[PDB]
Amino acid sequence: NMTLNFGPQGVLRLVLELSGEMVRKCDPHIGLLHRGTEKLIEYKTYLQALPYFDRLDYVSMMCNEQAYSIAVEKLLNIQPPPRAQWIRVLFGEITRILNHIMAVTTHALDIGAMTPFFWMFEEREKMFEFYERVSGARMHAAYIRPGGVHQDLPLGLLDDIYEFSKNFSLRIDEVEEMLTNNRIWRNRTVDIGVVTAEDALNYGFSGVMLRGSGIQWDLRKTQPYDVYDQVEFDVPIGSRGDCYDRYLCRVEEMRQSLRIIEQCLNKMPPGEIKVDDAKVSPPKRAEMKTSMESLIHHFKLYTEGYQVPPGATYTAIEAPKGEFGVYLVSDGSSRPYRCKIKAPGFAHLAGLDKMSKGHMLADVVAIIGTQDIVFGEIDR
Amino acid sequence: TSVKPIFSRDLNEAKRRVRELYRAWYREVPNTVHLMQLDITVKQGRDKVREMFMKNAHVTDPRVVDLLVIKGKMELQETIKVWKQRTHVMRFFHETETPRPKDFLSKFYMGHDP
Amino acid sequence: ELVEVLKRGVQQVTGHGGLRGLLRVFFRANDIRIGTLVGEDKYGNKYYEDNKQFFGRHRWVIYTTEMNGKNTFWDVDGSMVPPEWHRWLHCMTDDPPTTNPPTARKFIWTNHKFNVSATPEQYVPYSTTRKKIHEWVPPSTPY
Amino acid sequence: LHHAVIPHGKGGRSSVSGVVATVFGATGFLGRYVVNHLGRMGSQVIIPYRCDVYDIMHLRLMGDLGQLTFLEWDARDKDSIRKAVQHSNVVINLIGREWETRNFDFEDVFVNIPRAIAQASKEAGVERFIHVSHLNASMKSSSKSLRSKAVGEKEVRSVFPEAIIIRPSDIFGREDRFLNHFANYKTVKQPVYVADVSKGIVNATKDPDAVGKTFAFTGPNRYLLFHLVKYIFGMTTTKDKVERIHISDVMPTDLPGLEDLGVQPTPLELKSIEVLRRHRTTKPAKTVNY
Amino acid sequence: GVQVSPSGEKITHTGQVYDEKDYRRVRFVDRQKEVNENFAIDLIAQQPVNEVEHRIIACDGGGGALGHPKVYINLDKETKTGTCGYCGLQFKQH
Amino acid sequence: MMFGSDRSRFLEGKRAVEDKNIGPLVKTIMTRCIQCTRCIRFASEIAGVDDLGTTGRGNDMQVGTYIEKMFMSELSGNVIDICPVGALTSKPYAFTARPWETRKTESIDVMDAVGSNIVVSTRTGEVMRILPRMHEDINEEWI
Amino acid sequence: TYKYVNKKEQESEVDMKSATDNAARILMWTELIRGLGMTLSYLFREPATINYPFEKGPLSPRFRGEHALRRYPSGEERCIACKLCEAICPAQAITIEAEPRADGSRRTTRYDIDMTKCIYCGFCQEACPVDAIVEGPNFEFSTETHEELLYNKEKLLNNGDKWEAEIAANIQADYLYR
Amino acid sequence: RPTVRPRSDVTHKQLSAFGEYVAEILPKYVQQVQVSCLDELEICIHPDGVIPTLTFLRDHTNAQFKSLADLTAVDVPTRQNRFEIVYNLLSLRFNSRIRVKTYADELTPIDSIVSVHIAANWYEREVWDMFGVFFFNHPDLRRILTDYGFEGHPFRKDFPLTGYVELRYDDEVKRVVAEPVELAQEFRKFDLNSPWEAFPAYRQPP
Amino acid sequence: ASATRVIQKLRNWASGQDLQAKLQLRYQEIAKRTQPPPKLPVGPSHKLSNNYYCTRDGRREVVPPSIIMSSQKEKKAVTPAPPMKRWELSKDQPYL
Amino acid sequence: QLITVDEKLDITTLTGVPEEHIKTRKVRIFVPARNNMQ
Amino acid sequence: VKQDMPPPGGYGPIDYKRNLPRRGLSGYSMFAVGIGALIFGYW
Ligand SMILES: CCCCCCCCCCCCCCCCCC(=O)OC[C@H](COP(=O)([O-])OCC[N+](C)(C)C)OC(=O)CCCCCCCCCCCCCCCCC
Ligand SMILES: CCCCCCCCCCCCCCCCCC(=O)OC[C@H](COP(=O)(O)OCCN)OC(=O)CCCCCCCCCCCCCCCCC
Ligand SMILES: NC(=O)C1=CN([C@@H]2O[C@H](COP(=O)(O)OP(=O)(O)OC[C@H]3O[C@@H](n4cnc5c(N)ncnc54)[C@H](OP(=O)(O)O)[C@@H]3O)[C@@H](O)[C@H]2O)C=CC1
Ligand code: SF4
Ligand code: SF4
Ligand code: SF4
Ligand SMILES: [Zn+2]
């Protein structure tokens, strides 16, 4: 039936059974990026395992650290302080912006429009600069940890973030001019990968793939976890469930992120940054080098880390790609017994076959882009 | 003691499922050396199938047999549909490694292999 | 406002050691800008500055033509920048050595070495721990 | 024995085999297998090269980390051979051309260079030296290559009495100058496989009953040149090359053969299919004895 | 200080040298052996003994932080000095 | 970590103690003694020595011998396992490893004919130390 | 609070005016000339490019690059062989082996790092209670063999001696945040 | 307090009431209902109640547990039925979450629920590939994350971390061959668990 | 900022916006490298009295699951929670 | 619907573990001794 | 004596909506321009 294998030669392998130019069967293949994160974590303390989440869904990395942090804090029965919560929200929204830039621009790239990629990855560089100024790493900042945050913000960061938020709007508009009303974009996207709300639900979708079909589900307005309950923002919903609606949703999300960042900056509180419970979060170095108890706690935390009372949780985060979850099982030990990661790309790929019904070979490459398929969160 | 079964009631039905699976394999084998340009001969391939079947002959449990049938069917799928490759199929013969000699002396002389 | 641009350009051209220096610069560093010389390091490199350019091009360096016995007229590496100037060139600071000098400590390298990934003076690893199990040696005379 | 040599391991890439081998002739066609067989069991391998570093990159992945040491040399340059033979227990020589250049005659290649190699080996204090030659090595030979080979074997034995000469026949594999030479376009042949030859050499590298001896590595079967070339064409410029072609293979009598190292012949009727499918766009050959 | 062995190899700050009969010397051929020429065991000896008018003295290495944990040393044994287990410095009671 | 707090309210000066020398096997850093008397009692009762004791009173008090005596018994070496802290340590094992590195096998002695149950703690394939193992019908925590 | 994207507040008008406007949009290719104009505007701006080896990208005093083993002003080492770095290193990249030195001190005989295992996370310099191991600023240390990235006490001490004039300053900058 | 987590009892009440609700509707297929300190509701059941219970929770008007947030397995090799199976479910009409657990072993499969939730089509394949647990009435069930010739179930507790085989390219045969595993640095097993009890509330009796 | 009025007007007309106020290249508006030194606060548990861990441990305030309907040990119909309240269209911008 | 299979249980052919590591081995079941240090 | 990087009295206001301008002219005028050019050319 003109079968073919497409995608490789960047870890995707589709097996496509066509009928002429139409697409009849899409069989994705998985495990080309399966490393064994969920098993390795079982041989590592609750802190030796955090980087793995920065490495999962590697375009945000901090909405990933955040889920693990919230889960371990839910187990420990502690809560981080206001300043940490606000920093964490701010940077989660920044990661949202990064992810949505990534998605829109790689979509337009795999379709053929390539200049937004270069116009926006400069902003991505300018935000990696924040990542580095706060953590020392551009992408994989092991910066958000159970108990709050590692370090405080240097003295010239909020001003820079304000200068950036000033102009990101004009940049989004620069891109929208080219893309949103272009008849060719509308022809490539409109009425593509349509999906109804009930089938989405029963397939296990989350995020833009839900609220582009008229559903109202955002895990920040519902089941909030951080101070998000103290900040205002709108949730854009769609009407037809197509790539164009999802594009517009992601754009308006990039805008609500600026709306949230203005508030986070203006309302940043003072105080500590990590729970002052030195049996969970290490003490400062001066206290470590002058006080006995603080040094003992440092030693134990960095050799045999904090112990977590047994239990189980499922903490969901409204990540840029949807509900990111962690089923975390604990024995009364320094290390976990099981950590299962729920990623949306999983169900999205699962539903790709139905979403590619009555469509050509050149519409599948856009159906994929509309899911923001990263294979780290999938293959794990 | 008493159990709950899987895809069989007794080793007879289990063995006839096994024989159907062997029919399928035996028949398909040459198409593989044709599609993917393997060096080996169909005789070698068929001897290998026989060896991999008799490797699990002592088995008695209908359930332990049904599961092996399931897994062999998975492999046959992966093979008839060209998802495996020359590499995955030649990973059965071990063309690039010497075996642990089955001799107390050949073991003693080199290592602590017991 | 175009003739002023042309004037800025002609001064950018003639702002070097005539045609020879202009060619040298334009062909090693594909750039003919004019900036202020904040300093020069032991190895012959120069470091220029201009605060009206944008962030990332407001500081730069002209490497030496020779470094520890090597014709660096064409071959050039960011590994040539010693630490004190590395820290000002990657904009960790607003202050260069001349005004903010480092801490004079022995056991600090006086001569900087660049990357040696393949040179004959490169790095070869090994174990630093002595022999653990000492064997038995019998005497050199029988019975 | 030095503890750095005790063969600790399980016979694998990341193991130790106690074999420190300086190998000359690795950039070629048989070294490409000798080095693999040496390294995939955990041996240290010094490789001198004269080529450019690009032509020696197919060998960096056939041995574990740190076991391969690539250094440079020049046959005419002595004191570039001490570097390589020193720090070794075994030396292997595989050099040889199928033609003559300006700087290097058959005399040089097969007599003068191996002699210096063995001299430097003895000077250093190594314990094994392996030299490879042709099966038809003989002073009475239309080809002067074989003349030089049979001279160089003696010139070697005169400095390394306990050496090990190995006379295989026309070798066939991938990137070989025999089947590809035939398919580019009175005499019986018994060819042999690089895999078998390399296994034999790497086994002799340890086997204790191989010193001061010779070995004739020949296949299991024999064929008439015409039947063999027709088999080639069915499955599908040098004077000395054509001379070595138009010579039949000896049946060496009672000489320690291939099955005395432990190896077993691999018939050409099994690897021709993999060697020849590249030259595309059948029944076997009747094995005979004269 | 680096002092060479018969084979011609430099010795390290922990007395490591490939025995002249060792095959592992190959890796250094056409190359070098990376060795540090500044031996702490000597650079600290080059330092003088501090003197104090108190039988107990606290050491941190310098800056409060940037040093090491504050440790207290006794100076009742005029026979020898009081050494710090972190920095190596040594004190006396006068 | 379990039953104690997480910070100090002690903003005063600590104390320091003169370190003894009581043999080639036992290293003494006596500013870590928490005055528990396990060593004194072990010696007086099991080893029948009566040469350890407490000289002084108050915080100025400390443990050991009033003189430079050496503590060399057939049982000297269990004070190491019994001292809850690192005031008494083993000079051989000094600085060679840390507990979380060791792999622990359970074996027996051959030095004598008693068969004392023992633990051998290795690291990367080397034997690092030897410990007792409770067998209340043979050795009962001693070796 | 929610919003609508791709939904009109109400039906439109089929007036000749709006129909002709849409027909002009279609025929005259109006919505595309605006994209052409955006590209022209970008052509007439200044690019964000930089001469790399001469102009370097900006970093922070917290950057985590190449490793270094530090010393005290006296010149004495700092590592006391406490193994917290080896115990926290997620990738199990630090191998340590210590002994008592002839001067009776806790110092290492072996300290190896594998840069093909380090994920560059900084936990080792977060744990070091003496500020002896630091993930320095350097990032330009690529190689041609996999055997030049297996570091050791000597290489790391040389890197420390090399980069201390910068590591010390960056630590002076940032040590009040940690 | 500023370092401890707040504690709302309304959710505990609601979820205990719903536990009683569910358990008295399905006295069969039900056992070990429990709501925890952190206000999460688990319902343990018999392997014969999977589809009944999932359908009830999805369709029942009071429940509307539509979204299958996750499907998981968990290996506890000290109990005869060693493979715990976990369904994490979400309802939007109530803004609620629930956990439904069952048990299994080797040779004792579970019933598939692609009829109920189609998301499971891949989660169940993943469970079969990782923990070795068969499902009845699954259209396609095959290796999804592992290689094609992989023989084993690696997310168990007895399967070694580094595995049993290892891959590399060999010039002789010009392929990526598999071989036994020979590492140049054996993974180090750090024994960390402390001898001193940290949580008495979970102290088992002797 | 180093461009002539003609080019500025050309680009502004081609884009429709004003760029010389929302540029993406940074010209001295940014924070100053080499900032002064900070002095961070201290948490609330840095007291010297009334700071016992028994009151503020947390991870020991946990308790095992409160089990119900263990198989070995006319009510109304309830929901796992009161039904979700639907959302309100925004006021700033409810469309596009 | 129930069957009776009283023979000993074995899953060796499903574990995927090989012969070398399933017959050439010796396992130990115990309680780890207390560290006399603590 | 303390300093931990908070914001001052307040940051400026920010724009997060669209500003896509209404450009061009009317279809009637565009068609008239084109047709006038066309008729001039024909004549
Ligand atoms: C290195 C130096 C290179 C220098 C290159 C210089 C190139 C100069 C070329 C001219 C530049 C034009 C760029 C576009 C400027 C942006 C215009 C804009 O924003 O408004 C658009 C506006 C935007 O409209 P709008 O969508 O925002 O709103 C109006 C919508 N309607 C009309 C439906 C109500 O659209 C127009 O008005 C289009 C006007 C032109 C229509 C006629 C073009 C089609 C007919 C072609 C005739 C034949 C070709 C004629 C040309 C011959 C020579 C090639
Ligand atoms: C005397 C009175 C009467 C006289 C008779 C004549 C009267 C005038 C008649 C009017 C003539 C109209 C102009 C003729 C061409 C029109 C072609 C056209 O309209 O194409 C339609 C097509 C889109 O169609 P559709 O998909 O249905 O629209 C979306 C529906 N919502 O659009 C397209 O797909 C076009 C795709 C374009 C993609 C590339 C665009 C590049 C543009 C670069 C600029 C080119 C400018 C011209 C260059 C000139 C060359 C020198
Ligand atoms: N195949 C056959 O027909 C038979 C072959 N043999 C023996 O097999 C051995 C190898 O065969 P083959 O692998 O085909 O040889 P190759 O020609 O494939 O490569 C042999 C090596 O010899 C080296 N070499 C040749 N001449 C010189 C020189 N003048 N100076 C330095 N190095 C030189 C080359 O190094 P570089 O590539 O770097 O130049 C080359 O790598 C030969 O010694 C031959 O006697 C024996 C019997 C039968
Ligand atoms: S056993 Fe140790 S802590 Fe106890 S009194 Fe003796 S030296 Fe002090
Ligand atoms: S920075 Fe590298 S070496 Fe240091 S702890 Fe992290 S992974 Fe290990
Ligand atoms: S943490 Fe620091 S002092 Fe301790 S072993 Fe590591 S480098 Fe040495
Ligand atoms: Zn000190």
PDB file of C-alpha atoms in Angstrom, chain B residues 7, chain H residues 71 110-115 117-128 133-142 144:
ATOM      1  CA  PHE B   7      -5.177 -19.594  26.926  1.00  0.00           C
TER       2      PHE B   7
ATOM      3  CA  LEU H  71      -1.493   3.527  34.406  1.00  0.00           C
ATOM      4  CA  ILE H 110      -5.146  -8.757  34.006  1.00  0.00           C
ATOM      5  CA  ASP H 111      -8.072  -7.661  31.858  1.00  0.00           C
ATOM      6  CA  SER H 112      -7.479  -4.827  29.411  1.00  0.00           C
ATOM      7  CA  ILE H 113      -9.558  -1.655  29.533  1.00  0.00           C
ATOM      8  CA  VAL H 114      -9.029  -0.182  26.072  1.00  0.00           C
ATOM      9  CA  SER H 115     -12.801  -0.561  25.815  1.00  0.00           C
ATOM     10  CA  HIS H 117     -10.136   4.173  28.232  1.00  0.00           C
ATOM     11  CA  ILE H 118      -8.273   4.025  24.930  1.00  0.00           C
ATOM     12  CA  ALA H 119      -5.195   5.729  26.397  1.00  0.00           C
ATOM     13  CA  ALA H 120      -4.287   2.359  27.914  1.00  0.00           C
ATOM     14  CA  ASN H 121      -3.437   0.943  24.471  1.00  0.00           C
ATOM     15  CA  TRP H 122       0.173   2.044  25.052  1.00  0.00           C
ATOM     16  CA  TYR H 123       0.377   2.050  28.855  1.00  0.00           C
ATOM     17  CA  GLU H 124      -0.482  -1.655  28.942  1.00  0.00           C
ATOM     18  CA  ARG H 125       2.119  -2.430  26.278  1.00  0.00           C
ATOM     19  CA  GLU H 126       4.624  -0.509  28.395  1.00  0.00           C
ATOM     20  CA  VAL H 127       3.686  -2.536  31.475  1.00  0.00           C
ATOM     21  CA  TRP H 128       4.054  -5.790  29.548  1.00  0.00           C
ATOM     22  CA  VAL H 133       2.509  -8.669  32.810  1.00  0.00           C
ATOM     23  CA  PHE H 134       0.082  -9.889  30.159  1.00  0.00           C
ATOM     24  CA  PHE H 135      -3.287  -8.301  29.399  1.00  0.00           C
ATOM     25  CA  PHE H 136      -6.339 -10.055  27.977  1.00  0.00           C
ATOM     26  CA  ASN H 137      -8.134  -8.632  24.929  1.00  0.00           C
ATOM     27  CA  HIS H 138      -5.427  -6.194  23.834  1.00  0.00           C
ATOM     28  CA  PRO H 139      -5.325  -5.755  20.028  1.00  0.00           C
ATOM     29  CA  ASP H 140      -1.559  -5.250  19.767  1.00  0.00           C
ATOM     30  CA  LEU H 141       0.802  -6.116  22.626  1.00  0.00           C
ATOM     31  CA  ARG H 142       4.495  -5.836  21.819  1.00  0.00           C
ATOM     32  CA  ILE H 144       7.374  -0.471  22.810  1.00  0.00           C
TER      33      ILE H 144
END
